[PDB]
Amino acid sequence: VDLSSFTDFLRRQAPELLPASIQLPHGATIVALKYPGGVVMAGDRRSTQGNMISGRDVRKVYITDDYTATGIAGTAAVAVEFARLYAVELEHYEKLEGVPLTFAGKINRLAIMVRGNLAAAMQGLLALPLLAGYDIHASDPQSAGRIVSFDAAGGWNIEEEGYQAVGSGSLFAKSSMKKLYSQVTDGDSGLRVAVEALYDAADDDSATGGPDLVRGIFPTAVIIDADGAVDVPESRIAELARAIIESRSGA
Amino acid sequence: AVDLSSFTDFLRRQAPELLPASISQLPHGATIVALKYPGGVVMAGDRRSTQGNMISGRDVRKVYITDDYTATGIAGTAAVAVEFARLYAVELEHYEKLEGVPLTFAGKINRLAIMVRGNLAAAMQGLLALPLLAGYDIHASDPQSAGRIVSFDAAGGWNIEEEGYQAVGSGSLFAKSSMKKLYSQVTDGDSGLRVAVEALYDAADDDSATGGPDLVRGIFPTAVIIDADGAVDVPESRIAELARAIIESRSG
Amino acid sequence: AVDLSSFTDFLRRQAPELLPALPHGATIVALKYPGGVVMAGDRRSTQGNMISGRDVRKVYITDDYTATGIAGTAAVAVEFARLYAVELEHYEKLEGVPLTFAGKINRLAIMVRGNLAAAMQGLLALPLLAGYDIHASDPQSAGRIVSFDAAGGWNIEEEGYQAVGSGSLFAKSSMKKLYSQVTDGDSGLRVAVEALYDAADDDSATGGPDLVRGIFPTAVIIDADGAVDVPESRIAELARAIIESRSG
Amino acid sequence: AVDLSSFTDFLRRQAPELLPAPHGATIVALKYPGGVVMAGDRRSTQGNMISGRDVRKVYITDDYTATGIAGTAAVAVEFARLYAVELEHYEKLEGVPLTFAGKINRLAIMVRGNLAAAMQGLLALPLLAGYDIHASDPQSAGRIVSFDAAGGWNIEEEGYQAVGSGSLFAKSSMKKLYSQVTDGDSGLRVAVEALYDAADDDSATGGPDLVRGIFPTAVIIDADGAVDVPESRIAELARAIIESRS
Amino acid sequence: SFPYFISPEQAMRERSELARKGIARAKSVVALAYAGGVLFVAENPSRSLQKISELYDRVGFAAAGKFNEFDNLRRGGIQFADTRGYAYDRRDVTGRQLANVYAQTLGTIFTEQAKPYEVELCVAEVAHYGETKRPELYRITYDGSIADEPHFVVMGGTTEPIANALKESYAENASLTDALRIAVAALRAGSLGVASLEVAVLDANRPRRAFRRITGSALQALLV
Amino acid sequence: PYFISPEQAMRERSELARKGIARAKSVVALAYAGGVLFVAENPSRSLQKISELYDRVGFAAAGKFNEFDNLRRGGIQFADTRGYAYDRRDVTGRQLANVYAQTLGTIFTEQAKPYEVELCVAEVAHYGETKRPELYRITYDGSIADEPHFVVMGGTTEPIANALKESYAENASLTDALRIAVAALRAGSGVASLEVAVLDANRPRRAFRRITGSALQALLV
Amino acid sequence: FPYFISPEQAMRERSELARKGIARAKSVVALAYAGGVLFVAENPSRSLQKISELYDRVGFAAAGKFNEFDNLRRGGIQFADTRGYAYDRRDVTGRQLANVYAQTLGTIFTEQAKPYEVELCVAEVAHYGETKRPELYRITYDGSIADEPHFVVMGGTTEPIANALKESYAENASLTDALRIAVAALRAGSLGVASLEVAVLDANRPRRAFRRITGSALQALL
Amino acid sequence: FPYFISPEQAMRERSELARKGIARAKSVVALAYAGGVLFVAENPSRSLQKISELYDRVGFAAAGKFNEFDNLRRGGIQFADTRGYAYDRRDVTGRQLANVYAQTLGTIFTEQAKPYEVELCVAEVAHYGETKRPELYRITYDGSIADEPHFVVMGGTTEPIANALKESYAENASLTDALRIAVAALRAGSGVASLEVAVLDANRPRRAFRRITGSALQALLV
């Protein structure tokens, strides 16, 4: 049988290109939440090997097609490869079939890539992805946004709570959003609450780096609404960071 | 090579990557119950998922209608359970389209048993999936005794319940002991469905891995009832009503 | 199959045994100076506490605009540089055009990733890649430094310098202080030779400049005119400057 | 598939049974102007017992190269005959001998392909000595190449090298005696002395047996090719050293 | 040893003819769009052997030719659709894809097998419950040629007459009864009762599985 | 059977192929200021003859559909795979064409029936670069041609070929180019009957774009 | 059915089939000169090469069906790179690459469906600083191999081009003069940059001898 | 129109196809002498050998299509090296190499699409110090094997060369006398840069094979 799967093709012809199976830099926190007519996703920039900081500019959130982005937390090499591979997989099906995969198909395809890595993940090469998307074919535009998390066995879940996080600081980030969520009423307030949850995670977890004002490195974010997925510009985030920081001091 | 008209065999032969088996801390934990009422069978499951002591999910659906006269509820690793429910329904409908006629009830059982058994290696390594099958047999001589409940052990051994009820999952002992006392009260789909929601209530009471009715978020167990007219999803509201009834009885 | 035009592939299928499989320990540094990049490495090899080599070359020009320095077991490292150079030239001859910088990085990452199983058993090779990219818009910003983790993950340095090997922490801390002094290839070369001096000072596995035998770090500099080996004498004289300046 | 005119590949493909798959010896090698010399002891031990006293461990492998192998005696001997056939096989198929660099690379592949076995005791650590005719300077033409267990090879700039159980003693001795090397004869004396010193401090290395008349074996190689040194020229040199020691 | 070669042109004509004839000797089938969605009518005396089947949720299949050969293709299409719907989602399976596959398959059998397939087939797809999409019909020849039909498809036996009769009387968005009558009449030109008919529809008004067989008494009601 | 020799076997298949192409709908691809334009006569609404291969690389074919869809799919696999193993910028039209040549060349030689197809691989420059579009035509034979301004394949070409030769203009506006193409297409002989798309240099990443319905109708206006 | 096809009737037909394809293609000439080896081929296209580098001091030129000789170019590059890697770059020779092509074409001729409609030349200049007479080899579709002392001609109709060259060949000719002679010979068969593909194996270059002479410089040389 | 000959015919066609190809190639002679064995072949090329060393005291000479006999030269070298390794160098004989070539050609003849257009000679001199009559074997394309007492001739038109040899054969001839006789025999069939000379020297301690070239070859003729 033929599945127009770049990955399935790769396995038959090019196993070497695959991530494969059988300390490496890791440690990232990634959040995602739904706002009316939109979804936003953001991730920190740190990478650690044990106690040493190995990276401070790492991008972990990538737009994977016009209506979706993936954030991968875990081993950095694996996460980055997963991000590149999945995007090719998605555009490959579109070119072969002339039509993009349904949202549910995109999820299922990501789940198979995750699940097929469980062995490797047991050995430390973990990649736990978070998927954010807006569904055009969804019945209601306001409720279009989607957030999906994956457990290491490929099990996927579409959150109905409205927000989700993954990575070493994910518990902190989630508890923070639990309090801040009611304040989200539009893309800007949701983008504020996301950067704050990531701030809170960096506060309690040494593996998650918070905003570096000396070097000017900040979390990266992507927002997606009916007009597609767009990288949030650095300066809009920096401005949101200083607001939160300033606000944590006194004024 | 013989064509068994098996979707699973085809994958095993043609596309293994798709195969659920990943033999080589995951979200798991659920309690699923099933009982027989005259001319009927009902099945219900909780909505919680846990990773260690943390609650990983509170909306999980674990009971699925798999064809017009059967449903399956799976307890174990969540990813695995969902995969099985999806895979088995395809396997059933695939045979029907290829052969123009649905499998006999015994054939459906046998097919599920082979899928379970072929997962033993993985389940030894924690990827467990313990299914419970509820069905109505059209070809049964008597309509009243048509309903069927089948359980599977991890090696694929299957058993049909002459007792009238069964449960699987982390709170299954509690649920079973509860139904043992409440069963005599079952006379129809409605009383049958109450008893089931109560057994699941009792399971949630004594097992922290099984979640009971969440009145704050309005999340309740999911159920499916199956009689001669086929399998139907019980509407949330009918269950919420039943829950509150028991809850008030429990307190007063 | 599918042809990638990769010599590693065909070599593997036709002659896998030609493929690479204890001496180890080295410090390799690299930094960016405007319109340039420089890379240098020490000459020591050790087996336990014994010094097994004192002339080892660990930095190689791999094509006209790139060099690689490899840290880890020397046997794994020496071969690796050769194989990667052939891989690069092989694609150019088959396709008549050299690989884009991003493609050269990807090919190298794959070689490294393939070697992870063997790296878990000791045949570890951690490479550092330095290149000048003509296709990049700014000549000053043309220089590139790329590091690889054992799983093949690669990272491009926006820091300005990087190091790998047993004395890499010392070298990096040293450059962190000396970097502001780089303003051209000559100062950049000084800072690199100094960072390696500092690494040899605190790590017995890194050898510093041997004035008795006259063996010094080897270096390569790369700008818009291509990659050139720095001549020994210029390094020796930059070493004595540093030494003289420390005894002072 | 690509042909490499390698006897070894042929064996792997069609005669794997033939391929290879008692230890402790000392072997030395040094460069003298216009020449290289290589020598090895004759002892073989199994634990504390002396299993052999006549063992030859240095072999001329072609007109301009010799190899000395340290480790299990059987593995070492099999390796040398195989390497010599591999070298002459390429010459007959291509009509031209391999370049020195190619001969090194070929030995490295044979060594490396034995790494799993070496981890399990069938360790063969070779030392290669050769004179490169194509080399630009005749005086510096001679080459010494050592191999680590993984096949890593290194050409020797220090001017001398040793391998085997007494190799540290032999190396430290040459470190002092090297400046006295000015020609093949002095170079050969320094070699037999380094081996004498190794035998003095390592029980696995046997030194000159004057009762049975067994002495190290040596090979010298200059522009006129590789040649076995005659026993008597070595025995002589041995006696001089013993007398000098007093 | 050394290779030989055969005339390409001569083989094609005999092979193409071997097929043209067989399909001609076969019973006939028609498929046409209607308000209800898609209707399938085939002349079929046998009660056990189908010529019209369900492939997937909203995708139907009809064929004419040698039974063992198209049953074979029916099976493989069901394997292909079930597989793709499992690897992605049910909603990703399309009539266009199943057709494209059959084209590739017949195309290869035609070129590489000892005897080409004496079959002609139709893949039809109605819209998903609630959507509003024009029904799609595809015709795939033994040759492997594929056609995009707007209103109806005819295959098996003599089709010039049947296609024409339909052309003369086809009306878009017809009631089910009207469509059935039109189909029966077209079949007559090619060559009929509940006794000798095989009828089914892809009912776009069904929640999931669109495919439904109209049999016995229900069929009798439509005819009268 | 009509047992034949090396030379007529090729002669026959060669014909077998030629005829098949001759009997098919036609397609034209021509250089323009916008980059490259694709126009093909195509009645069908579901079956494409013009597709995207990679970022700045387009594909157009004429002949037997199942056979060129087959080629289209393998080209997309070859491009995706090379762009993954190296970088997206290392994938070129020249390489895709070189691959198709090798493929048709082998099918022609080793298959019972040679492919009845003719294809075009087109590449525009990358966003911001300034490079002359490239067009390649690959025959069923596997022969490859480097075309400077336009390519014509399918059915009867000479008329269509000359008509364009007579009126081709470099750096033509897209609408003008479209009109010229339709006219050339007519000589060979409608929107609901046309398949049109372009490879656009202006687009940042994916050059390919299909011009459909309203917009297309508006263009002729 | 104990009958067998005719081995002789196959030989002859294949042989012809090949011969015609070659005869029907563009032409190429390779000649020794002081600079080393010069390659000139009539080639209208700008993307499709007929002259390529194989290894450091080893060049390749072919005439015939493109997909078929591009195929042989690639495999020679694989064979050379692989031998250079397993031994040393200095162990790779033109003689070896030629010997390989002979074995290959020889086998395709006898076993593949259609023989290869190609004719090729493998040329090798000396290593930087050595003084060795260039070497030219021609390999036939049949797999026959020839050792050419001064020049080689392949593709289309050769006799005219061959004789003009024989009549006009000059040993150790300056590169421009040699190029003019080569082009002169090419016309004899029956010139613009737009009409040519030129390259040379340069003894002078330190490692990679091969260099393509293109555009402006080519025009100047002409 | 393609033909289907029968067994008898195929047998005769292959056989002819082979015999022609051989008759149309350069010639070679090998003759016994006190010195041992001498090999002379007309060969214009300077890179392509027709005479080679197989093992210590065993030489090889061939006539026919090059890619085909180079192929057999290589395999003989593999066979000899392998047996010498598995046992001892002294266990490898000319008789064995000949026996192998017979089996090989015999099989190619019967199973390949085309037979091998080659004829060959395997010669063996005695080991250093022994006193054994040289041995010469000729192996046909057919795979037939012949035990020749004094000389062997192969390639092109033989009868003339053969008779010239029979009429002028010298036993225990000085190397020079033998060379002159060989030249006369080769002369009848049809220079120093047109000859390939080599010999198996009984006197040499191990590798008896030696090529007589240039200057040294010049003196020997006269």
Curated annotation (Swiss-Prot), chain A:
Cytoplasm as UniProt keyword: yes
Entry keyword set: Autocatalytic cleavage, Cytoplasm, Hydrolase, Protease, Proteasome, Threonine protease, Virulence, Zymogen
Highest taxon above the source species: Bacteria
InterPro entries: Ntn_hydrolases_N, Proteasome_sua/b, Proteasome_suB-type, PSB_actinobac
Means of activity regulation: The formation of the proteasomal ATPase ARC-20S proteasome complex, likely via the docking of the C-termini of ARC into the intersubunit pockets in the alpha-rings, may trigger opening of the gate for substrate entry. Interconversion between the open-gate and close-gate conformations leads to a dynamic regulation of the 20S proteasome proteolysis activity.
Catalysed transformations (reactions): Cleavage of peptide bonds with very broad specificity
A matching Pfam family: Proteasome
Subcellular compartments: Cytoplasm
EC number from the UniProt entry: 3.4.25.1
Pathway named in the protein's UniProt entry: Protein degradation; proteasomal Pup-dependent pathway
PROSITE patterns hit by this protein: PROTEASOME_BETA_2 (PS51476)
Catalytic-site annotation from UniProt: A28 (nucleophile)
Gene Ontology molecular functions: threonine-type endopeptidase activity
Assigned GO CC terms: cytoplasm; proteasome core complex, beta-subunit complex
An individual GO BP term: proteasomal protein catabolic process
Key word tRNA processing present: no
SUPFAM superfamilies the record matches: N-terminal nucleophile aminohydrolases (Ntn hydrolases)
Entry similarity comment: Belongs to the peptidase T1B family.
Function: Component of the proteasome core, a large protease complex with broad specificity involved in protein degradation.
Protein name: Proteasome subunit beta
Species, as recorded: Mycobacterium tuberculosis (strain CDC 1551 / Oshkosh)
Gene from which this protein is expressed: prcB
UniProtKB/Swiss-Prot annotation, chain D:
Catalytic activity: Cleavage of peptide bonds with very broad specificity
Disulfide-bonded cysteines: none
Alphabetized HAMAP family for the sequence: Proteasome_B_B
UniProt function note: Component of the proteasome core, a large protease complex with broad specificity involved in protein degradation.
One Pfam entry name: Proteasome
Biological classification of the source: Bacteria, Bacillati, Actinomycetota, Actinomycetes, Mycobacteriales
Catalytic residues (UniProt): A25
Name used for this protein in its record: Proteasome subunit beta
Enzyme Commission number(s) of this protein: 3.4.25.1
Domain of life according to the entry: Bacteria
Entry keywords, A to Z: Autocatalytic cleavage, Cytoplasm, Hydrolase, Protease, Proteasome, Threonine protease, Virulence, Zymogen
UniProtKB/Swiss-Prot annotation, chain E:
Annotated knockout phenotype: Cells lacking the core proteasome prcBA subunits exhibit reduced growth and persistence in mice. They are also attenuated in interferon-gamma-deficient mice. They also display increased sensitivity to reactive nitrogen intermediates (RNI) and increased resistance to oxidative stress.
Activity regulation text: The formation of the proteasomal ATPase ARC-20S proteasome complex, likely via the docking of the C-termini of ARC into the intersubunit pockets in the alpha-rings, may trigger opening of the gate for substrate entry. Interconversion between the open-gate and close-gate conformations leads to a dynamic regulation of the 20S proteasome proteolysis activity. In vitro, chymotryptic and tryptic activities of the proteasome are both completely inhibited by epoxomicin and by the peptidyl boronate inhibitor MLN-273. Also inhibited by Mg(2+), Ca(2+) and SDS.
GO MF entry, a single one: threonine-type endopeptidase activity
Modified how: Phosphorylation enhances proteolytic activity of the proteasome.
Residues that bear N-acetylserine: S1
Pfam families in the cross-refs: Proteasome
UniProt KW keywords: Acetylation, Cytoplasm, Phosphoprotein, Proteasome, Virulence
PROSITE patterns per the UniProt record, alphabetical: PROTEASOME_ALPHA_2
GO terms for cellular component: cytoplasm; peptidoglycan-based cell wall; plasma membrane; proteasome core complex, alpha-subunit complex
Gene3D superfamilies in the cross-refs: Glutamine Phosphoribosylpyrophosphate, subunit 1, domain 1
Stated name of the protein: Proteasome subunit alpha
Curated annotation (Swiss-Prot), chain H:
Family matches, as PROSITE patterns: PROTEASOME_ALPHA_2
Pfam families the UniProt entry points to: Proteasome
A single BP term in Gene Ontology: symbiont-mediated perturbation of host defenses
Disruption-associated phenotype: Cells lacking the core proteasome prcBA subunits exhibit reduced growth and persistence in mice. They are also attenuated in interferon-gamma-deficient mice. They also display increased sensitivity to reactive nitrogen intermediates (RNI) and increased resistance to oxidative stress.
Pathway: Protein degradation; proteasomal Pup-dependent pathway
Presence of keyword Signal: no
Keyword Cell wall biogenesis/degradation: no
Location within or outside the cell: Cytoplasm
Highest taxon of the lineage: Bacteria
Post-translational modification: Phosphorylation enhances proteolytic activity of the proteasome.
Activity regulation note: The formation of the proteasomal ATPase ARC-20S proteasome complex, likely via the docking of the C-termini of ARC into the intersubunit pockets in the alpha-rings, may trigger opening of the gate for substrate entry. Interconversion between the open-gate and close-gate conformations leads to a dynamic regulation of the 20S proteasome proteolysis activity. In vitro, chymotryptic and tryptic activities of the proteasome are both completely inhibited by epoxomicin and by the peptidyl boronate inhibitor MLN-273. Also inhibited by Mg(2+), Ca(2+) and SDS.
GO MF annotation terms: threonine-type endopeptidase activity
Residues the record lists as Phosphothreonine modifications: T82, T176
Similarity remark: Belongs to the peptidase T1A family.
Note: Was identified as a high-confidence drug target.
The protein's name in its UniProt record: Proteasome subunit alpha
